[PDB]
C-alpha cells in the first residue's frame, strides 16, 4: 500500500539467489547436518515458565478447562509467524537488523528492539541458572542440607524461622541467599553466590566461541537430555503412588473461569512466551540451510511438539504436587490420630484414619471436659492442593521436599538439576544470537579482532549487571523482570512484522517467493491469517493489557524474617523512587520504533 521510494534494489530478486548458494559457504556458516538444525529450534523455545508459570496458570483459570484459550493461539498466530520467520531469512539470507534496512530504511529501530529485549532476558536467566548449579553444588551427600534444620546456639533444638516454617525454606532466606526485608535496603553481597554467578557466565562463552560451529557440535547432547530424564520422573511419580491426585486436579473443568477477560490475556502472553520470538537469530538460522528447503511442514512439526510436550511437562509436576499434598494430608491427621489418643487414649491398634471421627463422638460422649482441650488440625486435599507458587518456588521450595521423600533422596537431587540447566542453556542461545546478529549490522566498530574476540566482549560486558541480584535485596529486583520486562513490549515488536509484509513488502510479492522455495501455494487458511487474523488478535490482548494496566495496585512481596504471623508472606507496595525505573525496563525497547525515525528525519531533512 505504501510506495516505499527505493523499495527494491536492496533485496536479492529471486533470480540470482541460486548462484549465491555456492558462494555462501566461503563467507558464512552453514548447518552441517539435517539433524543439527532441528536440535537448535526446539531448545530455544521450551521451558522456563512453561514449567512453572504455565502449569500454575492451569489452577488459576480452571484446571481441566485451561487448554481452550491456550491451545488455539498455537494454531491461529504461532503457525503463521514461525513459517513467516523461516521464509524471509531464507529469502534475504542476511541478518535481522539488515532486514528492516532493506525495507523502508527509516526503520531499524526494530532490529535494536529485538536486541534490547534479548540482552536483558539473557542476563537475568543466568542468575536463575546459577542457582540451578548452586543447589547442584549442594547435592551429593547423605543428609541433604535443606532436609534438616540448623540448631540453636545451645546444641539443642532449632532456630525460630526453621521452627516456625519448614527447613526447606529457611535454607533459602539465609542459605540460598541472605535475605533483605524490603527492596529499599541492600544487605549482604553473597560473595560465594557471586562466584556461582561468575562460573555460569563461562560455560556459555565456552560453547559459542565460534558461533554456529561450536554450538552445532554442542547441541547434539543438550537438546535430547532434558526430554529423557523427564520420562523416568513420570514413572517415578507412579512409583511413589502420589499420582492421580494432582492429576485429577489437572482435570477440573471450570467453565466459570473462562469468560474472564484475563483468561484470554494470560493464555495469550504465555503462548507468545512458550515460543521464543522477536529475537532474529532464527532469521540467521534459516539463512544457513538450502534455499529450496521445505519449511512449511517444518513450521507444522516444531510448533506442534513445544505446545504438546509442555502439556506432558504439566502432567509430571502435578503428580508431585499430588504426592506432596498426599502425605501432608495425613501428617496432621496422624498427629490428630496421636492427638485423639493423647487425651482420650484409645488402644493404638483400634484407631486409624477411619471411625477416628466416630470414636471422637464416643470420646466427647464419655467426657466433654478433656474433649475441650484436644485441638485437632483439620486437613483436606484441595486444602493441600490449594496452595501454590509461581516463578521460582516450584523447583526450589516445593520439588525439593518430595525429593526428600525418596530412598535415594540425594541422588535424584542431582538428576533434577542437570535437566533444568541444559533447558535454560539451550534457551540461552538465541537471545545470545539476538545480540550478535544486530551487532554485525552495526559496523561502526573496527572490523579486525575477529568473532572470538567479539565473543569475549559480550560475556564480560553483560557480566557486570547481574551483581545487584547477588544482594540481599536482589531477589526483589528479579520479581520485577518476570512481571514487567518482556510482558507488554514483546507484542508490538511482532506487530510491526504484519504491517511490513502486507502494506509495504506486498503479500503478492511474498506469494511469488513461496512458489520459488517449495513450489505451489499452500492451503488457503495460510493466506487468510496473514491478511486479517494475526492483525486482529494481537491488539485484542494488547487492549487487555490496558484493562490490567491499572485496575490492581502494584505490589511486591517482602519476606520479613521477623514477621507477625511469620509463616506467610507480606505484600507491600513500592516507594516512589522505585516508580521511576519500572517504566524504563519495559518502555525503552518500545521507544525506538518511532525514536530512530525522528533522528532519521532530522538527519535527512
Amino acid at each position: 500500500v505504501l510506495p516505499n521510494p527505493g523499495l527494491d534494489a536492496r533485496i536479492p530478486s529471486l533470480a540470482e539467489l541460486e548462484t549465491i548458494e555456492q558462494e555462501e559457504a566461503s563467507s558464512r556458516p552453514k548447518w552441517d547436518n539435517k539433524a543439527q538444525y532441528m536440535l537448535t529450534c526446539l531448545g530455544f523455545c521450551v521451558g522456563l515458565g512453561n514449567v512453572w508459570r504455565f502449569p500454575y496458570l492451569c489452577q488459576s483459570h480452571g484446571g481441566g478447562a485451561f487448554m481452550i484459550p491456550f491451545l488455539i493461539l498455537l494454531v491461529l498466530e504461532g503457525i503463521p509467524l514461525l513459517y513467516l520467520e523461516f521464509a524471509i531469512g531464507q529469502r534475504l539470507r542476511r541478518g535481522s537488523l539488515g532486514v528492516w534496512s532493506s525495507i523502508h530504511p527509516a526503520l531499524k529501530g526494530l532490529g535494536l528492539a529485538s536486541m534490547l529485549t534479548s540482552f536483558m532476558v539473557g542476563l537475568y536467566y543466568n542468575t536463575i541458572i546459577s542457582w540451578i548449579m548452586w543447589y547442584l553444588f549442594n547435592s551429593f551427600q547423605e543428609p541433604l542440607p535443606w532436609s534438616d534444620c540448623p540448631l540453636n546456639e545451645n546444641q539443642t533444638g532449632y532456630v525460630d524461622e526453621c521452627a516456625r516454617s519448614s527447613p526447606v525454606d529457611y535454607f533459602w532466606y539465609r542459605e540460598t541467599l541472605n535475605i533483605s526485608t524490603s527492596i529499599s535496603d541492600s544487605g549482604s553481597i553473597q560473595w560465594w553466590m557471586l562466584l556461582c554467578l561468575a562460573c555460569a557466565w563461562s560455560v556459555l562463552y565456552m560453547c559459542t566461541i565460534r558461533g554456529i560451529e561450536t554450538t552445532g557440535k554442542a547441541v547434539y547432547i543438550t537438546s535430547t537430555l532434558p526430554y529423557v530424564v523427564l520420562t523416568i520422573f513420570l514413572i517415578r511419580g507412579l512409583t511413589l503412588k502420589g499420582a492421580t491426585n494432582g492429576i485429577v486436579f489437572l482435570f477440573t473443568p471450570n467453565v466459570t473461569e473462562l469468560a474472564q477477560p484475563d483468561t484470554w490475556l494470560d493464555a495469550g502472553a504465555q503462548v507468545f512466551f512458550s515460543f521464543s520470538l522477536a529475537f532474529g537469530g532464527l532469521i540467521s538460522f534459516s539463512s544457513y540451510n538450502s534455499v529450496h528447503n521445505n519449511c512449511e511442514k517444518d513450521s507444522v512439526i516444531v510448533s506442534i511438539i513445544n505446545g504438546f510436550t509442555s502439556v506432558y511437562v504439566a502432567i509430571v509436576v502435578y503428580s508431585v504436587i499430588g504426592f506432596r499434598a498426599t502425605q501432608r494430608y495425613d501428617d496432621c491427621f496422624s498427629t490428630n490420630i496421636l492427638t485423639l489418643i493423647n487425651g482420650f487414649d484409645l488402644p493404638e491398634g483400634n484407631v486409624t484414619q477411619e471411625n477416628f471421627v466416630d470414636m471422637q463422638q464416643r470420646c466427647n460422649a464419655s467426657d466433654p471436659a478433656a474433649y475441650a482441650q484436644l485441638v485437632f488440625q483439620t486437613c483436606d486435599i484441595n486444602a493441600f492442593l490449594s496452595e501454590a507458587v509461581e516463578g521460582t518456588g516450584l523447583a526450589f521450595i516445593v520439588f525439593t521436599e518430595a525429593i526428600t521423600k525418596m530412598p535415594l533422596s540425594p541422588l535424584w537431587s542431582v538428576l533434577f538439576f542437570i535437566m533444568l540447566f541444559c533447558l535454560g542453556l539451550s534457551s540461552m542461545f538465541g537471545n545470545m544470537e539476538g545480540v550478535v546478529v544486530p551487532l554485525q549490522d552495526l559496523r561502526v566498530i573496527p572490523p579486525k579482532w575477529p568473532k572470538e574476540v567479539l565473543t569475549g566482549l559480550i560475556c564480560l560486558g553483560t557480566f557486570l549487571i547481574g551483581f545487584i541480584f547477588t544482594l540481599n535485596s536482589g531477589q526483589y529486583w528479579l520479581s520485577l523482570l518476570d512481571s514487567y520486562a518482556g510482558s507488554i513490549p514483546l507484542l508490538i515488536i511482532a506487530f510491526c512484522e504484519m504491517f511490513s509484509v502486507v502494506y509495504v513488502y506486498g503479500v503478492d510479492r511474498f506469494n511469488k517467493d513461496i512458489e520459488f522455495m517449495i513450489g505451489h501455494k499452500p492451503n488457503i487458511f495460510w493466506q487468510v491469517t496473514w491478511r486479517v487474523v494475526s492483525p486482529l488478535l494481537m491488539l485484542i490482548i494488547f487492549l487487555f493489557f490496558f484493562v490490567v494496566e491499572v485496575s490492581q495496585e502494584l505490589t511486591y512481596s517482602i519476606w520479613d524474617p521477623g514477621y507477625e504471623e511469620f509463616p506467610k508472606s507480606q505484600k507491600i507496595s513500592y516507594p516512589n523512587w522505585v516508580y521511576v525505573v519500572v517504566v524504563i525496563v519495559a518502555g525503552v525497547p518500545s521507544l525506538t520504533i518511532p525514536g530512530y525515525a525522528i533522528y532519521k528525519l532530522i538527519r535527512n531533512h
Partner: peptide, 30 residues
C-alpha cells in the same frame, strides 16, 4: 570445610581448558 565447594572445584577446572582448545583450531585455520 565445605562440600559444595568440592563439586565446584572440579567444574571450574573443566571451564578453563575448552576455550583454548578451540583457540588452537582457529589459529590452525587462519
Amino acid at each position: 570445610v565445605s562440600i559444595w565447594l568440592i563439586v565446584f572445584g572440579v567444574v571450574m577446572g573443566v571451564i578453563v581448558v575448552g576455550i583454548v582448545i578451540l583457540i588452537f583450531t582457529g589459529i590452525r585455520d587462519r
